[model samples]
Target: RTTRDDLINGNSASCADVIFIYARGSTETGNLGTLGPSIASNLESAFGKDGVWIQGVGGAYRATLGDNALPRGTSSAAIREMLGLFQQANTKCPDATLIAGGYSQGAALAAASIEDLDSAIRDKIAGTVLFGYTKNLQNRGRIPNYPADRTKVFCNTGDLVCTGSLIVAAPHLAYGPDARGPAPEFLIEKVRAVRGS
Candidate 1:
C-alpha cells in the first residue's frame, strides 16, 4: 500500500539500504505505473519501510504508442533516461544494493540499459525483475551480461508481447496481481545474497 508518487515523479531519496529503479510500461501513467508500485511496495515490506527507496525512470519518453511500435519496442530517449537513473542511484547511494525492473516496453528499456552500462555500474546491480518482457523471445529470455541467477522474468502464458510480438493482451496486463508474490520473493533473495544474510 505504499504509493511512491513522488519517486514516480523523478524524486530521489538521500540514501537507503536498497534502491529499486523501475520503468513503467508503454502508455501507462506515472513512472512506476500500477505494476511497478505493487512490486516496490512488496519490496518495502520485505526490507522495512526506510530500508528501501523506489525511483521511477523519468524523461522525455512518455511510453508512447509510437515508441512501442518501434523495432526495439522502446526509444533511445527512454533508454538514456533509464541509464541515467542507474548511474544516479549508484552515485547517490554508494553502499546501497541496486535493483532494476520494468514491464513491457519498460522491460526492453531496462534490458537495454543493463547491456549498455559500464562494468562498475553494471556490477552494482544486485537484481533485475522484468514483467511481460518484450525482449523475451529476442534475447532468449535473458538480459545479456546480467547473471540469470540474480534476474527474474515474469512472462505470463499467452502474452504475445513476451513472445516478441507487438500484440498486448489480457495476460500482459495481469502481471501486477500475478507477480505480487514471486517477484518480491526473487528480489528479497537477491538482496540477501548480496548482503550475505
Candidate 2:
C-alpha cells in the first residue's frame, strides 16, 4: 500500500530507529497481521510518542498480493517471501531495526526467512517474535538447526494448530508478555506478519 512517493513525503521527518512487521494467518490469508501496530502502540505506551517505530504488514507472505504467491501454500515459502518484503521495507526505512513478529503461519514463515535470507539482513534484524506457532511445520519455528538466538516464542495454551513445545530462542535474553523494552512481545508477533510476500 506504500510507494516511493510515500517515503519521499515522510523524508522531511525523522522517525523511529526500528520498525515491526506482522504476517497474517496461514502466512497467506491467515498469518498474523496484528503485531505491527500492536507492538508500535506498546512501544509508544512505554517510550512515548518518540518510540520510533515504522510499522508494516506482509502481503507477500500471503496466498497472493500485488505480487505472485505460493501455490502449495507452505510456510517455508511464506518466510522467504516475508524476507523479500523486508528488503523492500528496508529501502524505505534505511536505519530502522527490524522485528519480524508473526504467529501460526506467520511464525512458520519467519522461521524460514531467517534460514534463507542474506546474513547482513538477518544480522540487521533485532529479532523475530513468534506465537501460536510450531517448529514441526515445514516452514515454521522450532526446527532443528533453527536459529534460536534470533527468535522468541509465546504460545496460546489452547490453539491445537500451535502444538509444538515452547522453545524460546535466546532464553537468557527471552522474556514473556509482561516483558517490557525491545524484547519480543509474543502476542504481538501473532498479530503481525500478514499479507503477500
Candidate 3:
C-alpha cells in the first residue's frame, strides 16, 4: 500500500524502466482480474522485478450497468492524479517507458485519461492495454488518443459490457485469468520496443 509520493521519493535514484498506472474495478487490491498483477508478472518475466513501477488508482467504482453514473467518470479524478504523478515520473526519468491498463470500470478510467492526454504526455506513453473494456463510449469514437498501433484493447467475445449483446456478467469476467487476455506478449513487445532492445 505505498503512496505515489512514497514511490516517487523513495527511489529517485533507481528510475523505473517502465511505469504502469493500473486501475481496478470496484476494488483496491492489485489482483482480482485487474491488469495490474498481470502486467507486473509480465514485467518480472521479461525484465525482472525492478523494471516496472506500479501506480494503482483509487476511487468509488460504481457499476456501469445502470444508475446516476451517466458521466461514467467516477474515477476520473483518480486518473487525473495518476496523470500528474505519471508526468512527474517521466520528467524525473526521461528515458522511462510509460504504460497503463485497467478492466471494466477501470478501463473507462484509462480511456478517459488517455483520450484527454495532451500531445506531450501522449507521446511519452508507450501504450495502454484495456481489458473487459466497457465499450460504453466506443460508439462515440472516444476510445483512445494514442496511435492505433500503440494501444491494445481486448473485449472478450460476447462481452455485454462492450458488445451490449447480453446483459450478463459471466462474459465480462472472462479476460483469460487475471485479465491478461492475450496482453502479456503484447505488453512485453511494447516495453522492448521502447527500450530499443
Q: Pick the TM-score winner.
A: 1
Per candidate, the number of residue pairs that clash is 0, 39, 0
Q: Return the TM-score for each candidate structure.
A: 0.91, 0.58, 0.80
lDDT of 2: 0.48
Clashing pairs in 3: none
**lDDT (Cα, tens digit) per residue for candidate 1, span 64-130:** 8668777667898888888888787777677889888888888888898899998899988888999
Superposed by TM-score, candidate 1 places the C-alpha of residue 197 at a distance from the truth, in angstroms, of 3.3
Off by over 4 Å in 1: 1-14
Stretches of model 3 off by over 4 angstroms after superposition: 1-10, 28-34, 59-68, 136-142, 164-168, 178-181
lDDT of 3 at 68: 16
**Reference-based lDDT, each prediction:** 0.81, 0.48, 0.63
lDDT of 2 by residue, 124-182 (tens): 66667765554534345353334566566665445444444333343312223423434
| TM-score of model 3 (CA atoms) | 0.80
